[PDB]
Structures are given as C-alpha cells and as structure tokens.
C-alpha cells in the first residue's frame, strides 16, 4: 500500500537532492586548489607530559584561558592540569569510573563529564568554601554519553548513544530540546564559533547539522562509509571535518551540502578517533588508532606531519584556543602537550 | 614578590599527588570485570535505569568490581571498547522461537576478533544447563535442526559425566562447548584465553569459578612479562 509509495517519493527526493549537489560540484576543490604553496614537513615535539592518570585517558578539553586543562580517565578521575608548570590544580573523584567525555566551561567555573552511566555531572570549581563538588546531576538519557559541550554557564549540549542529542538547563536540571533523527549512535559533536549551530556525527555514517533554538535538523551528509567517531568545526564556522572508522577523513561544508576533500592514504587501515583544526584552519590533526597523530592539511590534502609519541591509541585530541599547544591523550594515561 | 604563589601550587600538587598515590593502590587492588550475559539467560543471578550496575564482592580478600551493563541500546561495537582493561569478560550463554545459540555464537566471535579485546580473556558461562537436560531428553530436539553436524557427533573422550544426567544431554552440552571452543582456538593468537564453564544459574559457588579463572589470567599475564610463556 503506502509502504511502496513512501519509497517512491523517498527515492525521488534522494535523487532530487543528489542532482542538486552535482550541479554545485563544479570543481570539488581538486583542479583549482593544486596551485598553492605546501608548508612541507612540519615536525613537532612533545614539550610536556602528564603521567598522573592511572587508567586510559578518554577525553580532554582546554579552557578559555588556554592554561588549564581537564582530562577524564577510566579510573574515576577528573584531574585539571596546569599546562604551563605541570601542576594538578584539581583532582575530582567521580562516582562512576566509566567516563567517555569531558568539557570545560567557557568561563572556567564549571566542568562536565559523562560516560557509560548515562549521567552528565556538573562540578563547580569556583566554590566559596574552597572545595569541589557536583553541582548538577543531569539524568534522562537512555544511552551512553559520547560528547558534551558548554554553550554558556547555564546551557550544555550533550550527545548520547540513544541516537538522540539533547540540550540541558543546568539551572533547573531538565532538558529543553531533544534533537532526533539519527539512525546510529552519535559519537561526537562540536559547537560552531557562534553558539547557534553544531554538527554531530553518528555511527550511521551520517553527519547532521542542528540548530540549538529548535529541534530542527538543518542538513545531513553521508559521504563517509562507516561509523563517524570524531567531528570538529572549522574556525570560520562554515565547514567541519569528520573522522570515521574506515581510515579516512573528509572535510564537509555547509553552503555546499557535500564533501569538499577526502584525506586518505593507501597504508592507513585504522579508524580515526579524534580530529581538530588549528588556529587558521590550515592543519587537521587526526588521531588515528595506530598510536600516531597524522597531521593532515585542509587545503593540499597531503600528510605534512606525523606525531608518533604515544604507546597506545590516541583517544582524544584538543588544540588550544589560541593555537599555542596541541594536547593529545591516549590509552596509556600519558597526555603529552605538543 | 611573585614567586610565593608557586609553593601554594606545589603544596596543592603535593596533597593531590599524595591522594593520587593512595588511590593508585586501591585502584590496582580491585579487578574490574564485565558481565556481558545474553538477554533472558539469568545474567543477574549468574553470580548471586542506570547505564552500568556496579557489583562489589570480595573473594579471599580480593575485591572484584563487576559492571552489569544495563539500560543500553542494541548496538555494542562502540561501548565494548571501554572494557579492554578489564581482567575478564563474564560471558553467559543461554543453552536453550528464534535461534538463541547462534545469536550467542556470532557475538563471542566478534568479541574474540575485536582488535581492542584480543588481550582481554573471556570467561564462558553456559547457563540453563538444567533446562538443557529437559529439551534433549524429551520434546522438540531443536539442537538437531539448528545444527547439521550434531547428528554425526560423538562425545569426546575428555568428557567428565555428572550424576543425574542423560548421556544424550552430555553429548549435547559438550557439543555447544566445542562450538564455542572452535572460534577461540582457530582465530586466536595466544594473548587471551577462553574458559568454558557449566552453570544452572542456581549454583552457590559461582564466585569461586570466577576467582580461580581470574587467578589464572594474572599468572598467565605475569608469565608474559618475563617472556616465559
């Protein structure tokens, strides 16, 4: 009955949306961008090393001051390091030792952490008493938490393994918007420079684009071929990169509705776990599963550097807000500041 | 003066490091386990809301930390990677609608061949052995039409018969074990090991089988450090 009719309009809509992308695919940044100046081999060396964690590090996030750094490990710790002098400013003992994400507030007052407990706990650093304690216990999700990001001191965007993203209100503790439309587990998210839009790559090989004002899904991209494990916004706010489990990274775009470049090498066979951009959006440091941080190039698509100072897989990667340091975490509890 | 706040941080880095050292001892003194039992197989009572139901229990001054993963979705490929540091993976199988055994045979193969879980041993708990002795003794013999190599199968010479069991069930119980012990030997490399066990979900000593099996994993892990084994 209508089941077959529903597929006739869906296939035509998928073809109508595919032909429109082909019309805007004049060059795909492959024939005109070849006449640029490649920066060549950019060699980086580890300047600091944080070996205070006991279990595998799963996430990290820099603050607005670019000095402090919070790291989450699988031992029930939320140590807040001082990247300048290597000082453990705080050591928050978490309830559930299964932590899969962490974030730093844009003001440096609060810190969040999720994990397999489905709870996004908020901790207040600047307390009048001087100690640290959980400020809010956000509950409601039905799947493991993958990534959390702060809009402001009272708003926080999360993403769980229940194919749905959320937007909570720390003041009351209840969510206001529940983004829905993904088929696979959402693995990461990244806020735009302007806190109005954010992307979220899921396990269904589809990277969408939401608007924090409503529950509307602006766009959807399906360039990759496996579970998208990482995502990050371009410093300009009109593009974003996507790492997936099929050993390739693709730079998408919002105004083009399709992928521009596809960074891939014949030797790499391991999936990407973490990606991020530089201050000028010229470098794309992808964290592969081969214990190496292959520094790609957003323009030339050529691997211009490799960071191999890690024993285990690189589970997280964060560049500073000013571009001075690139802190990469790994499963051997060694967070080296590059 | 501008260096007086440094000792205030070095003392903050002293008590925290003193706490990061007393916590390092209690962390490595507890062995984290993973209960990945199949649904409707008595996984909760195999040793006897929230994303993970912790379970603290000690066996001879050894506090284990089991994590029953509940209230999660169907797809497990992404969240099974967080359990690579655990000592073992308690795998409970329902030995008895659709095909229940093949659903647990294809899952064990995925865990065994997962790149992150190739160094994590798996403890196998073949549950519902009391119900197994009733399906093969009389009624629908669903083990014969769901497996074509069971008719031309004989019980091995290493079988230890138990009192009160039918010989047709012993040939069936050990057949399911050989189906699990075929993937763990062919696709294996020698890093992780599989320990099969027989349970009826009512055993009052299930904490001893996990205790002895965990002692064999740490010994085999220590033997790998000195390049002995």
């Amino acid at each position: 009955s209508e089941l077959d009719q529903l597929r006739q309009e869906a296939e035509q809509l998928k073809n109508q949306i595919r032909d429109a992308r082909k019309a805007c695919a004049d060059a795909t940044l492959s024939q005109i961008t070849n006449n640029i100046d490649p920066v060549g081999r950019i060699q980086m060396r580890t300047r600091r090393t944080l070996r205070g964690h006991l279990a595998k590090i799963y996430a990290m996030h820099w603050g607005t001051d670019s000095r402090l750094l919070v790291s989450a490990s699988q031992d029930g710790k939320l140590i807040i390091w001082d990247s300048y002098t290597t000082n453990k400013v705080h050591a928050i003992p978490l309830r559930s030792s299964w932590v899969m994400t962490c974030a730093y507030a844009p003001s440096g007052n609060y810190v969040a952490c999720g994990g397999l407990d489905n709870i996004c706990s908020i901790y207040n650093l600047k307390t009048r008493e001087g100690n640290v304690r959980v400020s809010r216990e956000l509950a409601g999700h039905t799947g493991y938490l993958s990534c959390c990001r702060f809009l402001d001191d009272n708003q926080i965007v999360t993403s769980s393994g229940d194919t749905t993203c959320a937007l909570w209100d720390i003041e009351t503790g209840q969510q206001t918007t529940t983004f829905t439309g993904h088929t696979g587990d959402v693995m990461s998210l990244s806020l735009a420079p302007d806190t109005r839009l954010f992307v979220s790559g899921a396990c269904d090989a589809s990277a969408k684009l939401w608007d924090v004002r409503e529950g509307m899904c602006r766009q959807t991209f399906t360039g990759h071929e496996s579970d998208i494990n990482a995502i990050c916004f371009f410093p300009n706010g009109n593009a974003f990169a996507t790492g997936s489990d099929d050993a390739t990274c693709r730079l998408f775009d919002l105004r083009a509705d399709q992928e521009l470049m596809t960074y891939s090498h014949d030797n790499i066979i391991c999936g990407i776990t973490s990606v991020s951009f530089s201050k000028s959006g010229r470098l794309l440091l992808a964290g592969y599963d081969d214990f190496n941080c292959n520094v790609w190039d957003a323009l030339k698509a050529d691997r211009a550097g490799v960071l191999a100072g890690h024993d285990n897989r690189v589970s997280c990667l964060g560049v500073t807000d000013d571009g001075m340091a690139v802190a990469t975490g790994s499963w051997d509890s060694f967070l080296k500041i590059w | 003066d501008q260096r007086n706040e440094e000792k205030a941080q070095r003392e903050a880095n002293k008590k925290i490091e003193k706490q990061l050292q007393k916590d390092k001892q209690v962390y490595r003194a507890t062995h984290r386990l993973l209960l990945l039992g199949a649904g409707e197989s008595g996984k909760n009572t195999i040793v006897k809301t929230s994303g993970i139901f912790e379970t603290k229990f000690q066996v001879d001054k050894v506090n284990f930390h089991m994590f029953d993963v509940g209230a999660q979705r169907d797809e497990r490929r992404k969240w099974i990677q967080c359990f690579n540091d655990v000592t073992a993976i308690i795998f409970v199988v329902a030995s008895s609608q659709t095909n229940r055994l093949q659903a647990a045979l294809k899952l064990f193969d995925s865990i065994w061949n997962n790149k992150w879980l190739r160094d994590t041993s798996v403890i196998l708990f073949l549950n519902k052995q009391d119900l197994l002795a009733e399906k093969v003794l009389a009624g629908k013999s669903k083990i014969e039409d769901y497996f074509p190599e069971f008719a031309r199968y004989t019980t091995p010479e290493d079988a230890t018969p138990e009192p009160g069991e039918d010989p047709r069930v012993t040939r069936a119980k050990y057949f399911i074990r050989d189906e699990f012990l075929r993937i763990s030997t062919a696709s294996g490399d020698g890093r992780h090991y599989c320990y099969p066990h027989f349970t009826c979900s009512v055993d009052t000593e299930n904490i001893r089988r996990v205790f002895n099996d965990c002692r064999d994993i740490i010994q085999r892990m220590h033997l790998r450090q000195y390049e002995l084994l």
Partner: nanobody, 127 residues
Framework: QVQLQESGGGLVQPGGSLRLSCAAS????????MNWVRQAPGKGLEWVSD????????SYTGSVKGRFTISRDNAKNTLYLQMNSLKPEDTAVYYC?????????????????????RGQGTQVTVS
C-alpha cells in the same frame, strides 16, 4: 551513502530455487564483509550466512548449511544467495546486511533490532 538493494522473491514451492542478488553501491565492496539476515514473521532478526572479504571463508547457519550457497562477485558488487530445496519455514524477509567496519575479522550488531548498513529486504515466501 551506504545503499544495499536486493532483488528476487515471489512465491516458490517447497523444493524449488531462488537467487537473491544483493546490490551494493556507495562503498568499496571488497574491503568490507557481507552477511545475510532474515526476519521470520513475528520473530527477531537471525543470522543466516556470511562471506569473507574475498571468497576466503563461507560460513552458514545450521538450517542453511548444505541447502543454500552464498557467493559474491567483487567485479559486480552483487552478493548472491543460491537457495535450493526450500522448506515451508523459510518464509521470511531477506535483508542484505554489511559488516560495520573494513579490513577486520570481527562483525558486530548485524542482527541488531535497528542497524544503518542494511537493506530493505525481499519477501521470500514459500507456498
């Protein structure tokens, strides 16, 4: 865009034959494993048979071992399931599931209640 479309179907008598041609467009067909999952009426998704990356291992379930035959054509990206001597209990939809990640010997969540790299299925009913 991982798109898996199948063909075949219709009514066949017990003991007949059918060829389920599963198309695959949008990904490298060689780098990924292939699977066959069927959904009985009012029952859960069960695994039938899988094939290795390039014709290496051909595993079956209990009921289809010897009766069915799965083969892939890497030059045409078409997965086949040569069915022969069917039984009146084989009346079920036939999805063409793909393994989640490439160049691995592990396959996870192919029989899940909801998965992304699966097909629409064909109503292979037996008269």
């Amino acid at each position: 865009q991982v798109q898996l479309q199948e063909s075949g179907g219709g009514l066949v008598q017990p003991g007949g034959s059918l060829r389920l041609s599963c198309a695959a467009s949008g990904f490298t067909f060689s780098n990924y494993k292939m699977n066959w999952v069927r959904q009985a009426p009012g029952k859960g998704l069960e695994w039938v048979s899988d094939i290795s990356q390039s014709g290496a291992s051909i595993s079956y379930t209990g009921s289809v071992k010897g009766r069915f035959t799965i083969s892939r054509d890497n030059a045409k990206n078409t997965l086949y399931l040569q069915m022969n001597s069917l039984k009146p209990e084989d009346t079920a939809v036939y999805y063409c599931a793909r393994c989640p990640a490439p160049f691995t010997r592990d396959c996870f969540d192919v029989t899940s209640t909801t998965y992304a790299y699966r097909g629409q299925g064909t109503q292979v009913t037996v008269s």
